[PDB]
Amino acid sequence: ADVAGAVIDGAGLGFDVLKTVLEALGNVKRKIAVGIDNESGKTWTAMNTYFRSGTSDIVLPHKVAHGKALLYNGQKNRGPVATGVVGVIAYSMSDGNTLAVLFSVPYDYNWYSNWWNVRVYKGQKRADQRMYEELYYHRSPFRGDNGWHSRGLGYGLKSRGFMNSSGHAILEIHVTKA
Incomplete structure (x- = not known):
């Protein structure tokens, strides 16, 4: 599949797959x-996503082997509420x-900007508010x-x-052997 919760060939990850993934979400004010x-040569296995703000209906793809993406x-929570979509994804x-x-x-784009981060932690650590704090404040994200x-x-x-600057966000990341 070319769709959200899917694992594909690394070579196949590009803006076009992501663009469509984003439009399938329908019309909402904040979405990513x-x-x-995964070019790390290590096999990744999903733990979880901590949403500080927002939700997803996607099952976080369980097994991403070397060469798969x-x-x-x-998206942001439904209703008039003004919050974005802010989170941390954790694979073992x-x-x-x-x-x-x-x-x-x-x-609120007057006050804030789009941000992303990529960090390797030692051991198996599920994502929680604690980890969000580290990644967003103390680790100087992008x-x-x-x-x-x-x-x-x-x-x-x-x-x-x-990562783009808009509120309809596209984040494309490549983890590779150093």
């Missing part, structure tokens, strides 16, 4: 399509560690600046990712 290429999405890796990805898509950002993760891995 995420995709993550996962597709995900989230075959090396005994945790890949954690942060995404923040805000409501602004969705409409630009590509690469940073080393440790553990022989590095991350390459892109």
